[PDB]
Amino acid sequence: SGSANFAGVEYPLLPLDQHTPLLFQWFERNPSRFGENQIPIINTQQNPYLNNIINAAIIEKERTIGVLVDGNFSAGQKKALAKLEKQYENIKVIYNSDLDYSMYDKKLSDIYLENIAKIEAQPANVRDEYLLGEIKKSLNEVLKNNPEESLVSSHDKRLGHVRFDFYRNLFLLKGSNAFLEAGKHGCHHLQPGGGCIYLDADMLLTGKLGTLYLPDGIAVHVSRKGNSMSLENGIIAVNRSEHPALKKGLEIMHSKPYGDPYIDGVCGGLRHYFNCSIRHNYEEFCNFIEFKHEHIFMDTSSLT
Numbered sequence: 656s657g658s659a660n661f662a663g664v665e666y667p668l669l670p671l672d673q674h675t676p677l678l679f680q681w682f683e684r685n686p687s688r689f690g691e692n693q694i695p696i697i698n699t700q701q702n703p704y705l706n707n708i709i710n711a712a713i714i715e716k717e718r719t720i721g722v723l724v725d726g727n728f729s730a731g732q733k734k735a736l737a738k739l740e741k742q743y744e745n746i747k748v749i750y751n752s753d754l755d756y757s758m759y760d761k762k763l764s765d766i767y768l769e770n771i772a773k774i775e776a777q778p779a780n781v782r783d784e785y786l787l788g789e790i791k792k793s794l795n796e797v798l799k800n801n802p803e804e805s806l807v808s809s810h811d812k813r814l815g816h817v818r819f820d821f822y823r824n825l826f827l828l829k830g831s832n833a834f835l836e837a838g839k840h841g842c843h844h845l846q847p848g849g850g851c852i853y854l855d856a857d858m859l860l861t862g863k864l865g866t867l868y869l870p871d872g873i874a875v876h877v878s879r880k881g882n883s884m885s886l887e888n889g890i891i892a893v894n895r896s897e898h899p900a901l902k903k904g905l906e907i908m909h910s911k912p913y914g915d916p917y918i919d920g921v922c923g924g925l926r927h928y929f930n931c932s933i934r935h936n937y938e939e940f941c942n943f944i945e946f947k948h949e950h951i952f953m954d955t956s957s958l959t
């Protein structure tokens with residue numbers, strides 16, 4: 656279609672056809688909270704995430720709906736997830752452990768040594784001696800306890816959103832391919848190397864999305880609270896696998912000693928790719944990259 660503008664560089668609007676799969680994510684830290692034979696996805700009045708996922712499947716009947724799950728689920732809870740796959744044809748439950756992320760991994764000792772040499776290749780006047788000391792202390796901890804600790808194995812041990820955001824970016828790098836790697840059958844219109852549209856489980860679909868047009872085939876959620884705006888990872892849409900914006904975000908985490916999956920893997924990758932530097936208008940970049948669709952009621956866990 657048309658084009659989109661950021662400062663003086665112009666970007667073609669690439670399509671995300673109506674068969675681009677949707678992606679929901681639920682990593683359950685305490686599966687025993689649910690019934691032994693109950694679908695282990697939160698479904699309260701407060702947080703009706705399972706209902707929001709099913710309702711998206713009912714609206715997008717011919718579009719594949721991926722549900723990336725993880726957790727120490729009981730045997731009866733995994734059969735409940737299989738029954739969910741039966742009732743709703745387009746829902747594809749993908750276990751995060753069933754995917755191979757090793758091609759995006761890097762050893763922590765390599766990252767630390769690279770940064771120790773780089774910080775030490777500077778004179779005493781520009782040396783960040785506090786950062787230098789912390790990196791050697793992180794490296795010392797790895798060599799003493801887990802010398803083969805990697806970005807994946809380290810994030811696999813973390814508690815909280817930092818672990819969800821980490822695997823979320825890697826899945827989106829795989830894109831549609833992740834469904835074929837997990838062996839999900841009957842996706843029909845899924846193309847190898849195709850895109851994906853991640854949504855937070857509190858983002859409710861009210862109508863069909865149709866075909867989207869995003870600058871270079873990528874757009875993310877822009878949250879507005881009070882009078883502020885911010886890039887967010889509650890929605891990430893890509894038209895192809897290994898999108899260079901998400902690849903650059905992972906590249907930042909391969910070069911930073913303590914890279915964050917959200918701030919560096921998403922916000923850093925987008926701003927580096929589209930050249931949203933210190934000199935640029937952060938608000939202008941948000942309007943240019945924002946994921947807009949009136950058929951999505953965004954962020955309803957902020958009270959709705």
Ligand SMILES: O=c1ccn([C@@H]2O[C@H](COP(=O)(O)OP(=O)(O)O)[C@@H](O)[C@H]2O)c(=O)[nH]1
Nearest residue numbers: 679680681682683684819855856857889956
């Ligand atoms: O126990 C949890 C909590 C959250 N999430 C995922 O993290 C997303 C963000 O949830 P939340 O709205 O609490 O985070 P916030 O948007 O405030 O960062 C959810 O949509 C889920 O996909 C998850 O997998 N497990």
